[PDB]
Amino acid sequence: FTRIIKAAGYSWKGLRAAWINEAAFRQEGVAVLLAVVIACWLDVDACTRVLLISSVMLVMIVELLNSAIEAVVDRIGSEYHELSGRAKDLGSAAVLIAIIDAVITWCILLWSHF
Amino acid sequence: YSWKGLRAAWINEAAFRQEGVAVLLAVVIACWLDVDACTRVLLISSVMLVMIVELLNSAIEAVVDRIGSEYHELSGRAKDLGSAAVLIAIIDAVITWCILLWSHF
Amino acid sequence: TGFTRIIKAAGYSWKGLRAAWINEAAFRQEGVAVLLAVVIACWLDVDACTRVLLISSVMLVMIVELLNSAIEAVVDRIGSEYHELSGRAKDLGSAAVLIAIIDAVITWCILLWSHFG
Ligand SMILES: CCCCCCCC/C=C\CCCCCCCC(=O)OC[C@H](O)CO
Ligand SMILES: CCCCCCCC/C=C\CCCCCCCC(=O)OC[C@H](O)CO
Ligand SMILES: CCCCCCCC/C=C\CCCCCCCC(=O)OC[C@H](O)CO
Ligand SMILES: CCCCCCCC/C=C\CCCCCCCC(=O)OC[C@H](O)CO
Ligand SMILES: CCCCCCCC/C=C\CCCCCCCC(=O)OC[C@H](O)CO
Ligand SMILES: CCCCCCCC/C=C\CCCCCCCC(=O)OC[C@H](O)CO
Ligand code: NA
């Protein structure tokens, strides 16, 4: 059980860090709470309820990997002094597809539901 | 940041072009089928996930490259692991389509 | 396009999985929890929309942990060149893996508790 607390600390440290620093993460964190509430207050099925919640949760997972990747690029920024931003672009592409995915999910599921 | 990356993947990555095609295909096929929403959503978003992961694998490979590639076993490990992540995504999407359709028939 | 290449990429990927399993212990443990979970998903009498969600939620945990593992491998590569690491990137990666797990836990709960009365 010793490693699990070390890891969860890391995870929490990572999360607390994203929240202070990334404005978009604060927005997505907000989106998860609503997604939860809206999904729970609406009379829908579980398969719908999971997907309304899970699609949005995926946005967060991806903004979190993107933020990790951006953090690496920046460590190199300080030493190389090279501007190539190819990685940060690709990470942002990933986050966009994640968001689109959630939008589609929500449209399709709510459009069915209503 | 966002749009610049996708045009980059399409021009440079063949697999991304292949998955990007699969994404609209999946969408068309998903809408063409008479299924419920949970079904339709899962058909699309599974293929979409493959694309999302492929993009992250692509970012990572790009960072590996920005550092001089030289020779190192932590560079290759990264590209390989990232390469594996895309595979589980593809495997996942493949299973998904099976389960939904074997059922559908 | 060049389709001969698909086996080459598939090599790399397999190399990557073997890599994760040998080196990352957390990959082994979650993989155990995940493989167990997947198997249970196949034996449960649920609908297809339910079954897919049970499997894929858990599979994402694997997919996310694998990207974290790629990420950390890059941090380790920088570690050789530079001296001080913030740990900030590796932390975010650990966060991503957690949110993945929580999602799978939430999925499974919501789907089982709902579906089972
Ligand atoms: C129906 C059942 C619903 C179950 C519930 C679903 C929960 C969603 C999962 C994760 C949320 C992650 C939130 C991330 C918060 C990061 C920490 C943070 O913001 O810290 C504040 C900071 O310390 C100020 O100084
Ligand atoms: C009354 C009609 C029925 C209710 C209809 C919805 C009403 C509230 C809208 C959205 C909730 C949040 C989920 C929206 C899905 C996409 C979320 C997303 O991807 O967010 C990206 C992120 O916030 C970028 O910073
Ligand atoms: C119940 C039903 C069970 C169904 C079981 C299905 C098993 C076979 C699955 C997929 C085929 C193999 C696809 C191999 C693709 C490898 C290419 C790859 O991973 O490319 C990533 C690359 O690194 C670029 O970023
Ligand atoms: C349409 C419904 C499909 C549902 C089932 C599939 C779901 C995954 C989606 C696309 C796989 C795309 C595969 C592209 C080729 C393998 C991946 C790759 O990276 O290949 C590199 C190679 O060099 C390239 O030729
Ligand atoms: C009605 C109540 C139902 C309750 C249902 C609860 C269980 C949910 C199942 C799987 C989630 C986790 C699957 C993905 C793997 C996570 C990895 C993990 O948990 O690792 C622990 C670690 O290995 C320890 O040493
Ligand atoms: C029916 C399914 C069969 C299998 C049953 C398995 C049950 C596991 C459930 C919950 C564990 C949740 C534990 C979450 C611990 C924190 C994870 C974390 O922080 O992971 C980050 C780390 O860096 C990663 O490498
Ligand atoms: Na690649």
Numbering used by the authors:
A (entry chain A): 7 to 120
B (entry chain C): 16 to 120
C (entry chain B): 5 to 121
Question: Which passages does the manuscript contain on this structure?
Answer:
Diacylglycerol kinase (DgkA) is the smallest known kinase. In Escherichia coli, it is responsible for the adenosine triphosphate (ATP)-dependent phosphorylation of diacylglycerol (DAG) to phosphatidic acid used in periplasm membrane-derived oligosaccharide synthesis in response to osmotic shock1. The enzyme has long served as a model for integral membrane enzymology, folding, assembly and stability. It is a trimer with three active sites of the shared sites type that exhibits moderate positive heteroallostery, random-binding kinetics and lipid substrate promiscuity. Each subunit has four helices, three of which are largely membrane embedded (H1-3), whereas the fourth, an N-terminal amphiphilic surface helix (SH), anchors the protein at the membrane interface.
However, in our studies of DgkA to date, we have crystal structures that include a total of 10 trimers with density in the active site for bound lipid that is variable (refs 12, 17 and this work). Mapping these onto a single active site makes a convincing case that lipids reside in the binding pocket. Their variable definition likely reflects acyl chain flexibility and lipid movement during reaction.
